[PDB]
Amino acid sequence: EWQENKSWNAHFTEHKSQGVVVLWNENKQQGFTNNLKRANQAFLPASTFKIPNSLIALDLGVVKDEHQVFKWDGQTRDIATWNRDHNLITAMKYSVVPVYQEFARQIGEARMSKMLHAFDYGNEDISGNVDSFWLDGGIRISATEQISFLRKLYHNKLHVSERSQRIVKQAMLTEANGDYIIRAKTGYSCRIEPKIGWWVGWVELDDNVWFFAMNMDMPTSDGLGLRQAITKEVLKQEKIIP
Amino acid sequence: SMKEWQENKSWNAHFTEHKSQGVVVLWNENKQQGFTNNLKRANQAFLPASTFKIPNSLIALDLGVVKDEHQVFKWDGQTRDIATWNRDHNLITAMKYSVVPVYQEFARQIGEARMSKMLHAFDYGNEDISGNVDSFWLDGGIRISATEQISFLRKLYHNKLHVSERSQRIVKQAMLTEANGDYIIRAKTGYSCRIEPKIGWWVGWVELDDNVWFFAMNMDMPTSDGLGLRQAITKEVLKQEKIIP
Ligand SMILES: [Ca+2]
Ligand SMILES: [Cl-]
């Protein structure tokens, strides 16, 4: 079931914003959120789509392994970290859109649609550019739907090879210490209103796993760090992390 | 500057500062070159102690003794000195807390014949497991040097060991120790505390955006009070060489 804890809204309004956090306790099969309506509202996934895009590119052989080098095309884009060679690990880390646009072109519309239907990923609608539909096209996915998809990935239940799922979970690694491991992906939907930031993933503990998906209003890029900061505030307050 | 192995005695100051002695060995994967404060000790073979949990994990996975990283190894109900051992574990947490009893059971199930054959294929150390099948890495005959640990770890990193790619990916997951926006460390600690010379170990690697740095260190450990020096001295070297900030 789901519990709504409206008191968590303060975590957003104290930053002059609005948003949703969704938590899932895997051992207890219990969900929590500050806002049930928005937890189930579907938005563009923006660069959180790099999780399914990575899986499809690996399973089909577009990407051989996490070491294959994708050479910079020599065109200088706005984010300096994009203007260099990458592998799957660093393309995820710096959210290198052009590398993933090339993945999508090579996958093709037909195979992309077939795979997203098999994943049950959002509204499964890739209209718009084959190479940008997750940024300004027709695909929409909610925070609760992100949890469902991530749970399948965590348990190697998606209809792609076990190897592809293990490689993407490695590439999602974001933080690790003696208390917890976070595997996750950020997103920033900055073209189509409502402009929002995403953070989706999970926290591995010794004894349990907490899945999470959050999004928040993002009228400018100045607030992007609040995606992880707000989430961690909630995790700390609830004694999931120290 | 073309030498495969180069001695840099300036790192000794990190040992001297902590009234300690030992060896740090680094390997720059992009440049295929190595660095150490003590070439002689870098090539001296010691009991691996709990750094042996890396090969032991690989063998148990590949033979099916361990199904995967979620299988639960129930506590046998016997209360031992390290409190974190006295509970149920999986591969991730058994590696993290270095739960010896779990891996002793692994070794008994693998058996001496299959254990010997696998270490031979791994070319691991002196490949000699005389002693108890269940404790030879703690007080038996197997010995491995720091440079030999590097070579073995490089094989693991590239999935070049003879076991399945899946077994190798799982163990590399279980070796995860630290990760942030600057680096990822996959490593395993050890403490040889039964047979002289008593020593501590830390072996593994540091993943950067555009390179990997393998490391293996051991140091004299007359009592357990200095165990934190294994990571501290290693990190002091990594900082001096600008590998981590
Ligand atoms: Ca595959
Ligand atoms: Cl990992």
B92: chain A residues, CB-CB within 8 Å: 204, 206
The reply, when asked if residue B108 is annotated as ligand binding, is no
B72: chain A residues, CB-CB within 8 Å: none
Rounded-to-integer distance, Cα B31 and Cα B24, Å: 18
Chain B nearest-CA distance from A90, in A, is: 6
Chain A nearest-CA distance from B85, in A, is: 13
Are the C-beta atoms of A30 and A240 separated by less than 8 Å? no
**To which residue do tokens 């001297």 refer?**
B16
- Which residue in B1, B20, B50, B167 is the catalytic one? B50
Burial per residue of A28-39, b for 16 or more beta-carbon CB atoms within 10 angstroms, e otherwise = eeebbbbbbebb
Longest Cα separation, chain B = 56
* Beta strands per DSSP E along chain A: 2-4, 19-25, 30-33, 42-43, 141-142, 173-176, 181-189, 196-204, 209-217
Q: Quick check: B208 contacting A, CB < 8 Å?
A: no
Half-sphere exposure in the Cβ direction for B191 (13 Å, CA)? 16
Number of H helices, E strands in chain A: 10, 9
Strand pairing report for A141-142 and A173-176? unpaired
**To which residue do tokens 């051991």 refer?**
B218
Rounded-to-integer distance, Cα A214 and Cα A193, Å: 17
CB contact under 8 A, A93 and B178: no
Query: Residue A59 Cα, ligand 1 centroid: separation in angstroms?
Result: 5
In sequence order, what are the beta bridge partners of B202?
B189, B217
The reply, when asked if residue A95 is annotated as ligand binding, is yes
Instruction: For residue A228, give the amino acid letter.
Output: Q
Rounded-to-integer distance, Cα A174 and Cα A241, Å: 15
Which tokens belong to A70? 């994708």
Active site residue A132: no
Complete DSSP assignment for chain B: ---SEEE-GGGHHHHHHTT--EEEEEEETTTTEEEES-HHHHT--B--GGGGHHHHHHHHHHHTSS-STT--B---S---SSGGGSS-B-HHHHHHTT-HHHHHHHHHHH-HHHHHHHHHHHT-TT----S-TTTHHHHSS--B-HHHHHHHHHHHHTT-SSS-HHHHHHHHHHTEEEE-SS-EEEEEEEEE-SSSSPEEEEEEEEE-SS-EEEEEEEEE-SSGGGTTHHHHHHHHHHHHTTS--
CATH 3.40.920.10 for domain B1-245: no
The reply, when asked if residue B145 is annotated as ligand binding, is no
- Which residue in A47, A54, A142, A189 is the catalytic one? A47
Rounded-to-integer distance, Cα B29 and Cα B45, Å: 23
Stretch 144-203 of chain A: residues touching chain B, C-beta under 8 Å: 162-163, 166-167, 170, 173-178, 181
Which tokens belong to A169? 């979970």
Bond prior to A194 in cis (omega within 30° of 0): yes
Strand pairing report for B184-192 and B33-36? unpaired
Spatial CB neighbours of B116, under 8 Å, sequence gap ≥ 6 = B127, B129
Kindly state the DSSP code that residue A47 receives in the 8-state scheme. Answer: G
In sequence order, what are the beta bridge partners of B214?
B27, B205
Residue A95 sits at the vertex; the CA angle it makes with A152 and A17, to the nearest 5 degrees, is 85
Spatial CB neighbours of B210, under 8 Å, sequence gap ≥ 6 = A90, B30
CB contact under 8 A, A174 and B179: yes
Task: Name all contacts of B130-139 with Cβ < 8 Å and 24+ positions apart.
Answer: B133/B107, B133/B108, B134/B104, B134/B107, B134/B108, B135/B104, B137/B47, B137/B48, B137/B49, B137/B50, B137/B52, B137/B56, B138/B47, B138/B49, B138/B50, B138/B100, B138/B192, B138/B194, B139/B47, B139/B194, B139/B195
Q: Which residues surround ligand 2, an ion (CB under 5 A)?
A: A 170, 173; B 173, 176
Rounded-to-integer distance, Cα B168 and Cα B155, Å: 10
Return the residue of A nearest to B212 by Cα.
A67
Among the partner-chain residues B169, B177, B209, the one whose CB lies closest to the CB of A90 is B209
**Fold observed for domain A1-242:** Beta-lactamase (3.40.710)
CB contact under 8 A, A176 and B178: yes
